[PDB]
Amino acid sequence: PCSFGGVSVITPGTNTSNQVAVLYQGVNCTEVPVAIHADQLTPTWRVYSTGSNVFQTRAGCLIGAEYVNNSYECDIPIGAGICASYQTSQSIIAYTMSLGAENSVAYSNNSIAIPTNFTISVTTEILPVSMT
Amino acid sequence: SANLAATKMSECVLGQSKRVDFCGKGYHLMSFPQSAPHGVVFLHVTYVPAQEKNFTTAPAICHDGKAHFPREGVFVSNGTHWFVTQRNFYEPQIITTDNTFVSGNCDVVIGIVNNTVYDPLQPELDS
Amino acid sequence: SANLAATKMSECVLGQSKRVDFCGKGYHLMSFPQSAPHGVVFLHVTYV
Amino acid sequence: KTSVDCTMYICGDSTECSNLLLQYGSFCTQLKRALTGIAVEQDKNTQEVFAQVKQIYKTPPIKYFGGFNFSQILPDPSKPSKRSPIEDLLFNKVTLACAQKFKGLTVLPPLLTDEMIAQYTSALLAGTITSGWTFGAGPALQIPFPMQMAYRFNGIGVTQNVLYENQKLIANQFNSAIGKIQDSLSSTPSALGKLQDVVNHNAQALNTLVKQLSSKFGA
Amino acid sequence: NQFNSAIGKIQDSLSSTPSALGKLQDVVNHNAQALNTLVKQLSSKFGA
Numbered sequence A: 001p002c003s004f005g006g007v008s009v010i011t012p013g014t015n016t017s018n019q020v021a022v023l024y025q026g027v028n029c030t031e032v033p034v035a036i037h038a039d040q041l042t043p044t045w046r047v048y049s050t051g052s053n054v055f056q057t058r059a060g061c062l063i064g065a066e067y068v069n070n071s072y073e074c075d076i077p078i079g080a081g082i083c084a085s086y087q088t089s090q091s092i093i094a095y096t097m098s099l100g101a102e103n104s105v106a107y108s109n110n111s112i113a114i115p116t117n118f119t120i121s122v123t124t125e126i127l128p129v130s131m132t
Numbered sequence B: 001s002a003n004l005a006a007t008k009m010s011e012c013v014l015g016q017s018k019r020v021d022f023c024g025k026g027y028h029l030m031s032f033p034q035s036a037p038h039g040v041v042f043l044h045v046t047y048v049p050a051q052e053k054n055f056t057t058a059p060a061i062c063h064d065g066k067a068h069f070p071r072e073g074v075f076v077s078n079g080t081h082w083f084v085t086q087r088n089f090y091e092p093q094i095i096t097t098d099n100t101f102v103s104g105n106c107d108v109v110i111g112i113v114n115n116t117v118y119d120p121l122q123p124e125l126d127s
Numbered sequence C: 001s002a003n004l005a006a007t008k009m010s011e012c013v014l015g016q017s018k019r020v021d022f023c024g025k026g027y028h029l030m031s032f033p034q035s036a037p038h039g040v041v042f043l044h045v046t047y048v
Numbered sequence D: 001k002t003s004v005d006c007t008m009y010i011c012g013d014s015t016e017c018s019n020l021l022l023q024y025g026s027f028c029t030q031l032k033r034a035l036t037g038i039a040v041e042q043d044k045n046t047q048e049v050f051a052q053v054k055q056i057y058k059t060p061p062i063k064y065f066g067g068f069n070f071s072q073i074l075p076d077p078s079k080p081s082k083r084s085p086i087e088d089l090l091f092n093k094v095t096l097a098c099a100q101k102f103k104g105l106t107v108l109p110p111l112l113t114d115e116m117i118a119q120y121t122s123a124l125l126a127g128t129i130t131s132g133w134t135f136g137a138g139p140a141l142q143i144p145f146p147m148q149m150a151y152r153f154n155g156i157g158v159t160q161n162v163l164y165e166n167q168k169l170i171a172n173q174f175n176s177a178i179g180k181i182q183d184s185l186s187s188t189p190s191a192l193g194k195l196q197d198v199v200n201h202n203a204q205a206l207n208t209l210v211k212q213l214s215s216k217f218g219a
Numbered sequence E: 001n002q003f004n005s006a007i008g009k010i011q012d013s014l015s016s017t018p019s020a021l022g023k024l025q026d027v028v029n030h031n032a033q034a035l036n037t038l039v040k041q042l043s044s045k046f047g048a
């Protein structure tokens, strides 16, 4: 085929800023300027397809956001355990999810833990019932 | 969704349920319905324990070649004496015959301990 | 099927179930999830 | 999960056909929205089942539980991934079935990987072994495993001296049953048809859609 | 006292700006878009 048709764009929201990131599903970093024919594309499209913020994921090649090491909860999915978010000057970062806090409880032959106080809590549940 | 909401009304609201996490998160106490556009909102009231402490415990208690098992509780000790408490809230009490029941002797159960079981009647029967 | 699996995780695994035949065939004691491709496998320990 | 491309499928790299296609309107954007909704719903479906506890508990180091043996179901650290032996048999049996067609059709990857799912099931197993039902209602409260088993025996209506007097016999029966599960699953008549049919249905549907492109529809 | 305080917090938390009622906004939005697209489709030549 001539050209790869569509890409995937990650935006924080035109409310917040105008930065983006682009995901090239199914291709690999080194040949991304090819198979998009980056040479004939206008500038401001050639800013992507190459650069210093180039990342490789199981889902594809991600250009426009850098890879921190620490972890947070998911904000915008990208696939294969990789999320992304807009956060501190101000930029777009991409990380790995954190499944949750870490804990380990003590098991012993003859020890038992017993509560000594209680709390009462109220929670909500929203359900639909009908449509137009 | 309509069928689920009808089930939640029948069980949550017009009764107290024991299905886990069906009717709120915790031990269920009651629920209250409200009305929304095209929908419904339940307010669940639950019970959540807090402020636990560690103790040391035993299966049974050997006494006179007999093994007492708790009736509705668990034996615990504060390092010196052995009580029996209910299970979700800490209330120590003196181990008596009204609290326990007896089955067999002390060679079969693993982890049995030694203590005394006070009898309510004998102190009344002074003579 | 997914909603069923979530309900079984709540009732069967994080608790002890009184419904008949919901969690196994017998009287239910406990269960252990195990992961599998596109689903999950339960192991229902009962009394007979 | 799957995805589609209006133009690359309908009009094959033919710019006159692509120009003419604009007349029909919003049809294939409708198709795209439907498919995207399905794709998101799949990841939610996986999330609901497994992500039930925030707190990730860990296996105790000492492996004495009064005579109950769980090595079959607990994660095995020696093999590179933390997959229990039974999970290994399952991942070897189901997977008899990212393709050469790519006529506008892809297969997107899941959001949670199998390492993550294995971590979640390990957390639930560890919590359940150490504390009883308590960890799904509040904070984890440790309890000896035979005392937990006595609690459950009371639950089903048999007094609790019975467990303490037949502890060894009970442990042996439970270990033997866990052992036999491996072989029952290794039995050739696949009990895993339920999970094989999903991959079969999807592959066959995609093949039919692709093979439809070599048809003339009375032209 | 715990009960009363909890109910007060419930009202405030619902009153929080973030969309907590999206499951009910979607039922509205879906119908709106369906009708809009159906009207839009009238302006297609369909090969004529």
Ligand SMILES: *[C@@H]1O[C@H](CO)[C@@H](O[C@@H]2O[C@H](CO)[C@@H](O)[C@H](O)[C@H]2NC(C)=O)[C@H](O)[C@H]1NC(C)=O
Pocket: A116, A117, A118, A119, E001, E002
């Ligand atoms: C159980 O927790 C409650 C709070 O939920 C404790 O009540 C507090 O007690 C302190 C000391 O008397 C007061 O200053 C607070 O105002 C109380 N809180 C409320 C909401 O009334 C209670 O003391 C705890 N139980 C025990 C045995 O300490």
Ligand SMILES: *[C@@H]1O[C@H](CO)[C@@H](O[C@@H]2O[C@H](CO)[C@@H](O)[C@H](O)[C@H]2NC(C)=O)[C@H](O)[C@H]1NC(C)=O
Pocket: D069, D070, D071, D072
């Ligand atoms: C729990 O069960 C496993 C599985 O039977 C035991 O592992 C066996 O250990 C014996 C003694 O080393 C070996 O002869 C078997 O070949 C082992 N089985 C496998 C599959 O490797 C394990 O020993 C048991 N737990 C304890 C504490 O003994």
Ligand SMILES: *[C@@H]1O[C@H](CO)[C@@H](O)[C@H](O)[C@H]1NC(C)=O
Pocket: A015, A016
């Ligand atoms: C952008 O969002 C903020 C808060 O979400 C809001 O105050 C602001 O009015 C929005 N921008 C416009 C142009 O409405």
Ligand SMILES: *[C@@H]1O[C@H](CO)[C@@H](O)[C@H](O)[C@H]1NC(C)=O
Pocket: A028, A029, A030, A031, A056
């Ligand atoms: C991307 O391409 C280069 C060279 O074409 C290759 O060395 C590399 O392995 C490829 N990426 C992956 C993930 O295999």
Ligand SMILES: *[C@@H]1O[C@H](CO)[C@@H](O)[C@H](O)[C@H]1NC(C)=O
Pocket: A107, A108, A109, D062, D064
């Ligand atoms: C419990 O007892 C067993 C055997 O008596 C022993 O292997 C284990 O270390 C003990 N655990 C603790 C915490 O004392």
Ligand SMILES: *[C@@H]1O[C@H](CO)[C@@H](O)[C@H](O)[C@H]1NC(C)=O
Pocket: A106, A111, B054
């Ligand atoms: C008490 O329980 C806590 C659980 O958080 C544990 O860390 C501590 O070691 C225990 N102390 C004992 C058993 O003396």
Ligand SMILES: *[C@@H]1O[C@H](CO)[C@@H](O)[C@H](O)[C@H]1NC(C)=O
Pocket: B078, B079, B080, B081
């Ligand atoms: C244990 O409880 C008894 C009875 O209340 C008390 O006399 C004793 O001092 C307690 N022991 C400790 C170590 O607190």
Ligand SMILES: *[C@@H]1O[C@H](CO)[C@@H](O)[C@H](O)[C@H]1NC(C)=O
Pocket: B062, B113, B114
């Ligand atoms: C309990 O008391 C009996 C009384 O004869 C004694 O034989 C046994 O050794 C005692 N056990 C412990 C653990 O003190």
